[PDB]
Coordinates of N, CA, C and O in Angstrom, one line a residue:
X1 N -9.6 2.2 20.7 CA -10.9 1.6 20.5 C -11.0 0.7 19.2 O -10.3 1.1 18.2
X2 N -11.9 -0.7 19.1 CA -12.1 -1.2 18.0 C -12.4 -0.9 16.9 O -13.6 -1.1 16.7
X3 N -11.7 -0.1 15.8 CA -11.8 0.1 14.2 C -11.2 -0.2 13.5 O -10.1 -0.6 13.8
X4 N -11.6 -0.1 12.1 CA -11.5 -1.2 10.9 C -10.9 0.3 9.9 O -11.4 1.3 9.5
X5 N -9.4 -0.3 9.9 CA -9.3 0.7 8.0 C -10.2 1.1 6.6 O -11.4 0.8 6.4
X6 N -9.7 1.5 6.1 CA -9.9 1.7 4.8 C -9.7 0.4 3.9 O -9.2 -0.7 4.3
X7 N -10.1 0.8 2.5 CA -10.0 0.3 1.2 C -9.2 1.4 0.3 O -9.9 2.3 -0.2
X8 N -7.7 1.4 0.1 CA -7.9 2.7 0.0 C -6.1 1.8 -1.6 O -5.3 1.0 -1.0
X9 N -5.8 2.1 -2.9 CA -4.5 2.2 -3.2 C -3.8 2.8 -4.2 O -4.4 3.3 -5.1
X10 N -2.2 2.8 -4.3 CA -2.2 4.0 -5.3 C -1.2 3.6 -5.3 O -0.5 3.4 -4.4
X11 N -0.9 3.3 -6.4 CA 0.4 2.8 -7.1 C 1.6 3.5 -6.9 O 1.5 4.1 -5.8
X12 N 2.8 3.8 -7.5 CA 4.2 4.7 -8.2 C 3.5 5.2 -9.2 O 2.6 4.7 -9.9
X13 N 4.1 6.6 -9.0 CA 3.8 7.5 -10.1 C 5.1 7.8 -10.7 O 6.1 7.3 -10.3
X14 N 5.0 9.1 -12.1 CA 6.1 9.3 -12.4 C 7.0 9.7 -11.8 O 8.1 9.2 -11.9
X15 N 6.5 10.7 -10.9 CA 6.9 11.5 -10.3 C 7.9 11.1 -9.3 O 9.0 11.8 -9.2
X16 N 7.7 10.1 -8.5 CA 8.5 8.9 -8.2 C 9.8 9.0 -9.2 O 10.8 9.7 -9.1
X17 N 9.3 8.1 -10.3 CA 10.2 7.3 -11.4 C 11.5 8.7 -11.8 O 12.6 8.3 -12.2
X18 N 11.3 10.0 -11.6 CA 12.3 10.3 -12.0 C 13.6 10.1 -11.6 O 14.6 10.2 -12.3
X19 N 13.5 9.6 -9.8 CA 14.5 9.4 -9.2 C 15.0 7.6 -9.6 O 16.0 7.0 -9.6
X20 N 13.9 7.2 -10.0 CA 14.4 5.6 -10.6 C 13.9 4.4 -9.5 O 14.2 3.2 -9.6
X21 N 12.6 5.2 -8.2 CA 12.2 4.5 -7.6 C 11.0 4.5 -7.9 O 10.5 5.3 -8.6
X22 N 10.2 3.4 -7.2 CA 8.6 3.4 -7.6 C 7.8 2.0 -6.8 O 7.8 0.8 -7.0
X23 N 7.4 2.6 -5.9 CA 6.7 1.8 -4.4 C 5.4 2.2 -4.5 O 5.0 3.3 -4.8
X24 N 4.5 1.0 -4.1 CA 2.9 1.6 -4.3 C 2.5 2.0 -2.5 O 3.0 1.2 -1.6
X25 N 2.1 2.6 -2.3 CA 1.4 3.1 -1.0 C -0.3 3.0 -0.4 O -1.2 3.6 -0.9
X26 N -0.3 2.2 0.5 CA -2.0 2.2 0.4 C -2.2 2.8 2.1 O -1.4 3.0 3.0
X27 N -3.9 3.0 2.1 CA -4.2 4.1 2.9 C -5.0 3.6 4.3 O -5.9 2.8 4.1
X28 N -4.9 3.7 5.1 CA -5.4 3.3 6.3 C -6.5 4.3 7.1 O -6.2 5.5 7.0
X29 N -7.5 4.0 7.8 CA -8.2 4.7 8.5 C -8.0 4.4 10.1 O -7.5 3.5 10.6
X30 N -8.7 5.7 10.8 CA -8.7 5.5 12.2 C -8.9 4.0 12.8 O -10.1 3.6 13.1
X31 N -7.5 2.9 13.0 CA -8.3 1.6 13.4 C -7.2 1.3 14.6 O -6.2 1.9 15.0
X32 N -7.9 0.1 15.0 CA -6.8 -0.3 16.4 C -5.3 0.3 16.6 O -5.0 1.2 15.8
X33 N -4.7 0.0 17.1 CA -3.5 0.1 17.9 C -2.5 -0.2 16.6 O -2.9 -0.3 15.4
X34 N -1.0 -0.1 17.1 CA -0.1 -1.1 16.0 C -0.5 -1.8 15.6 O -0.8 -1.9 14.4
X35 N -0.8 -2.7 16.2 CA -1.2 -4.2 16.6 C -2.3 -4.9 14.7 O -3.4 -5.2 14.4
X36 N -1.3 -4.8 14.2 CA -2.1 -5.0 12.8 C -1.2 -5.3 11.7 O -0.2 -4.7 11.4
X37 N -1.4 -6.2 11.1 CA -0.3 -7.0 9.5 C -1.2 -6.3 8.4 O -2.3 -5.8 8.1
X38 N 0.4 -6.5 7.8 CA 0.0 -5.7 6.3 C 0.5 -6.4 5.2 O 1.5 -7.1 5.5
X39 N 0.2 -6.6 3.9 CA 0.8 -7.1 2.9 C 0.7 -6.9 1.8 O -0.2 -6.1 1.6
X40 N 1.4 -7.4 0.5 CA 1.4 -6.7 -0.8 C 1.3 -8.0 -2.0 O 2.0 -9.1 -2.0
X41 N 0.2 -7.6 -2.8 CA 0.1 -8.8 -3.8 C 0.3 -8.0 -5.5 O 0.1 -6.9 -5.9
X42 N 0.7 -8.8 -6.0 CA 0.8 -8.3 -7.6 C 0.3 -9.3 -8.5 O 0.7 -10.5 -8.7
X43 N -1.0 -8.6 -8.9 CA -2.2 -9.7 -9.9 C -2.4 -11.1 -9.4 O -2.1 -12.1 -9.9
X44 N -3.3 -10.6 -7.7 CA -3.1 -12.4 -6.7 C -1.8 -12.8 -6.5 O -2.0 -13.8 -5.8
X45 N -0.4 -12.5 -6.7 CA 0.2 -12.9 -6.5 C 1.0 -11.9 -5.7 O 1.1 -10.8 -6.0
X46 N 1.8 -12.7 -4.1 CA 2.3 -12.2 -2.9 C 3.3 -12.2 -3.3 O 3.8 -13.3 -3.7
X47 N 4.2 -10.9 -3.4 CA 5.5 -10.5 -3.6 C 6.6 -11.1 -2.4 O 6.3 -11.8 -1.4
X48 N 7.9 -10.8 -2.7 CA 8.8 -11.5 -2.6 C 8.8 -10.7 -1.1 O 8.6 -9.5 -0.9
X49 N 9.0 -11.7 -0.1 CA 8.6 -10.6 1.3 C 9.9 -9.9 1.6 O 11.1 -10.2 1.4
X50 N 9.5 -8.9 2.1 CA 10.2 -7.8 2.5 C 9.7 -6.6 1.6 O 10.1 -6.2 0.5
X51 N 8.7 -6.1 2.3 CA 8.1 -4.8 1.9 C 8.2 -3.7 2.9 O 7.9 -4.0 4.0
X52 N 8.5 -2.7 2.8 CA 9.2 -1.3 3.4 C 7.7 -1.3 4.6 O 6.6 -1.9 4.7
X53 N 8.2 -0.4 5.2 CA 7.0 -0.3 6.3 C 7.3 0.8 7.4 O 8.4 1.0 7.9
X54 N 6.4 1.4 7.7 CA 6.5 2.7 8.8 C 7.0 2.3 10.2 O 7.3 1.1 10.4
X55 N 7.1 3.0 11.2 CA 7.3 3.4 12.5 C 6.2 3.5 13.3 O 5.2 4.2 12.9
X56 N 6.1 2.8 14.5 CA 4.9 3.0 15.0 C 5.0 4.5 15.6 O 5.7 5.1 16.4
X57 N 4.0 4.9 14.7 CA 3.9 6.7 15.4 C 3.0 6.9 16.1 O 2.7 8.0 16.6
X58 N 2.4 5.6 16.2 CA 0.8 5.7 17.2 C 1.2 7.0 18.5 O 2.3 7.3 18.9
X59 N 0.0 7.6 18.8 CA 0.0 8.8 19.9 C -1.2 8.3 20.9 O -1.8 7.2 20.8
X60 N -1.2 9.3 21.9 CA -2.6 8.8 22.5 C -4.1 10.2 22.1 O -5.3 10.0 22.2
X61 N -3.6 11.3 21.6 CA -4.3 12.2 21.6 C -5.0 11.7 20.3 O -6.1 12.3 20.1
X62 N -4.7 10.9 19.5 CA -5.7 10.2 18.1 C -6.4 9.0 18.6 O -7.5 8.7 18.3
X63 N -5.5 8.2 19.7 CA -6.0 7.3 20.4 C -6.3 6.0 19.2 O -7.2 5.2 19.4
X64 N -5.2 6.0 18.0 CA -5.2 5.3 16.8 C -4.1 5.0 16.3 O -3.1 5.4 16.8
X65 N -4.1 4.2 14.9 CA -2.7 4.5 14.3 C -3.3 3.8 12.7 O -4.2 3.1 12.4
X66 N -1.9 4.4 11.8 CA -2.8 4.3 10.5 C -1.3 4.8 9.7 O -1.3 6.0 9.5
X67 N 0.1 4.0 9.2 CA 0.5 4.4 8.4 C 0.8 3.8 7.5 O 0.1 2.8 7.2
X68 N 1.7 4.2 6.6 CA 1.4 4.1 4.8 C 2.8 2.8 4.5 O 4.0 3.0 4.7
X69 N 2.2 1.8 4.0 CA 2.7 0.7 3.7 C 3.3 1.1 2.0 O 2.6 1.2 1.0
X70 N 4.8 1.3 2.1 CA 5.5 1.0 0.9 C 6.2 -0.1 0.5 O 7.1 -0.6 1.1
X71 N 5.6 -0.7 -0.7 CA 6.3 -1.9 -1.7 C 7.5 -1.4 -1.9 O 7.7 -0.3 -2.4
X72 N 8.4 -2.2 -1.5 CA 10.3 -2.4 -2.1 C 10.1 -2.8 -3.3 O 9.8 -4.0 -3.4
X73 N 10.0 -2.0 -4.4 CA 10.4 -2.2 -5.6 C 11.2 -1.4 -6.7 O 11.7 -0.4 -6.2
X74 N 11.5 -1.5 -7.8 CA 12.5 -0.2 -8.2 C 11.9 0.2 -9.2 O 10.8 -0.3 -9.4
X75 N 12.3 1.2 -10.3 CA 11.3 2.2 -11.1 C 10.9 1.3 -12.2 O 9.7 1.1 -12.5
X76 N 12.1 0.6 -12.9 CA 12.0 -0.1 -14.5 C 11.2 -1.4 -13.8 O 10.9 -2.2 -14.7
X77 N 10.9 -1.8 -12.5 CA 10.3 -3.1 -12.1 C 8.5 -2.2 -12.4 O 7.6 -2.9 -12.8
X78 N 8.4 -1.2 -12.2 CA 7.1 -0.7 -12.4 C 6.4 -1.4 -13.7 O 5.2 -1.5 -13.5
X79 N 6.6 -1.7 -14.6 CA 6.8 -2.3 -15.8 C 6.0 -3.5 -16.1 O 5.3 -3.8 -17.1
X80 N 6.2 -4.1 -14.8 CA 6.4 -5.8 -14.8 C 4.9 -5.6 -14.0 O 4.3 -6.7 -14.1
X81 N 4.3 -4.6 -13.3 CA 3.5 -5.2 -12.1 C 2.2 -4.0 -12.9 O 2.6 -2.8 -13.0
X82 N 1.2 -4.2 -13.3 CA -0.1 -3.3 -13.3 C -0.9 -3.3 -12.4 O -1.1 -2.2 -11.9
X83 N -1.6 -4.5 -11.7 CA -2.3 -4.6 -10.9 C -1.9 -4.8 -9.1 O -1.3 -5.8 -8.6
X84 N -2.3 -3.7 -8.6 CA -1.5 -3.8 -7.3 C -2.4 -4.4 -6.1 O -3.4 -4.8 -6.6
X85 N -2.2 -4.5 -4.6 CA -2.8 -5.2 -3.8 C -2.7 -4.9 -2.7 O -1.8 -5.4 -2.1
X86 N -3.6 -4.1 -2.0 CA -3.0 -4.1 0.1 C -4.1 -4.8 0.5 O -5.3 -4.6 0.2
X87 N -3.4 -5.8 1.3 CA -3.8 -6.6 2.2 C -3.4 -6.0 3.5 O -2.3 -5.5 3.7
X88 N -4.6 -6.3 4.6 CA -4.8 -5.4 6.2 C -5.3 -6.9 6.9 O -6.0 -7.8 6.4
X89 N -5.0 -6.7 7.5 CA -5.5 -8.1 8.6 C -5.2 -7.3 10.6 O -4.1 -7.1 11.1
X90 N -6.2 -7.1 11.2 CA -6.4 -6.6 12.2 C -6.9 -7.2 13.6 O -7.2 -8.4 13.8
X91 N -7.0 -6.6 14.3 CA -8.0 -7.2 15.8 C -9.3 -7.4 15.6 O -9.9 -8.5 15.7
X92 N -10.1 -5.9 15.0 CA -11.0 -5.5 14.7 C -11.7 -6.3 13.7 O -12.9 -6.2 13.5
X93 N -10.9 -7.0 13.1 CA -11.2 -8.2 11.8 C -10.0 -8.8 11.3 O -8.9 -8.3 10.8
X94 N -10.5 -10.4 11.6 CA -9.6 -11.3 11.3 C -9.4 -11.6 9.6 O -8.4 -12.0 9.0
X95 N -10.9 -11.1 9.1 CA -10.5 -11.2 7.6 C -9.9 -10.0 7.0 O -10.4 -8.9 7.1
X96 N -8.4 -10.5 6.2 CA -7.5 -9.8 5.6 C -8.4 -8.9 4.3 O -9.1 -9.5 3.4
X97 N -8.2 -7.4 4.5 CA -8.5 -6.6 3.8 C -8.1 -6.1 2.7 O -7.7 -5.0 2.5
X98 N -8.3 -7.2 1.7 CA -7.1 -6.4 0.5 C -8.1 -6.0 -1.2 O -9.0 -6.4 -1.9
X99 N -7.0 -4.8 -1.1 CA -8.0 -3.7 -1.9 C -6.9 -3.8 -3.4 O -5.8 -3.5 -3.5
X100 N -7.7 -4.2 -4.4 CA -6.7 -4.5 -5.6 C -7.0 -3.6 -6.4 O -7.7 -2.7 -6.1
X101 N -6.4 -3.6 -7.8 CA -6.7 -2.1 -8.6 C -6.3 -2.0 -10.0 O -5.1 -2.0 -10.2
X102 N -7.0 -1.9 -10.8 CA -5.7 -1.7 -12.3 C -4.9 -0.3 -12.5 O -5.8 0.4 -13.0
X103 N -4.1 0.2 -12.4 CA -3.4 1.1 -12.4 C -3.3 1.5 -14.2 O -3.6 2.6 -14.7
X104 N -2.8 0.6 -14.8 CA -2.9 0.3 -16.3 C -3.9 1.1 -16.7 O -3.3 2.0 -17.3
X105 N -4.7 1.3 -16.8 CA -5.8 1.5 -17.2 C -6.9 3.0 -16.7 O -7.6 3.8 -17.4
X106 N -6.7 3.0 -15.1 CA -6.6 4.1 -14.1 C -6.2 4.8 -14.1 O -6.7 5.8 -14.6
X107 N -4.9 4.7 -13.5 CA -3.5 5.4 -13.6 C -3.1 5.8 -15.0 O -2.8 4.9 -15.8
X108 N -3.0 7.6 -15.3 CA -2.8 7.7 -16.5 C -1.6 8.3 -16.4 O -0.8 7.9 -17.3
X109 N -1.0 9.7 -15.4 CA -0.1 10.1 -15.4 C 1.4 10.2 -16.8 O 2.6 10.3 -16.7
X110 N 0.6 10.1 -17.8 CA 1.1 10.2 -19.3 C 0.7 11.3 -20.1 O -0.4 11.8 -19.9
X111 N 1.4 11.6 -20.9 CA 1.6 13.3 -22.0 C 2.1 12.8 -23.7 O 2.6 11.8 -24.3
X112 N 1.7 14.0 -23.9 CA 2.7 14.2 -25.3 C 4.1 15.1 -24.9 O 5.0 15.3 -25.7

């Protein structure tokens, strides 16, 4: 059935970073079929394409599909990028959905 995702994003955490990787992940809702593009911007600006991306796991008993779009990027590049971006573009809506965010600022995941 015709539905529209979420607004939903979340950067690399440390927790990530200890392995030396760090991919932002953004969140999708009950919406159409596969049948849906995805994409990743850093401060308005569209990364270098080739961003990681799921399996259609679509079922019929959800009668939906909705997975988690990871940025190819690496830990010490986390650095370079504060403000992150998912862009959704669907059936259900031809205008691309992109949900931006300061993490910098947000995102505190820091100690003594």
């Amino acid at each position: 059935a015709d539905a529209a995702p979420t607004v939903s994003i979340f950067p690399p955490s440390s927790e990530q970073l200890t392995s030396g990787g760090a991919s932002v992940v953004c969140f999708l809702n009950n919406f159409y079929p596969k049948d849906i593009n995805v994409k990743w911007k850093i401060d308005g600006s569209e990364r270098q394409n080739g961003v990681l991306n799921s399996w259609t796991d679509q079922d019929s008993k959800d009668s939906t599909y909705s997975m988690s779009s990871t940025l190819t990027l690496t830990k010490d590049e986390y650095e370079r990028h504060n403000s992150y971006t998912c862009e959704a573009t669907h059936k259900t809506s031809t205008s691309p959905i992109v949900k931006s965010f300061n993490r910098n600022e947000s995102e505190n995941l820091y100690f003594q």
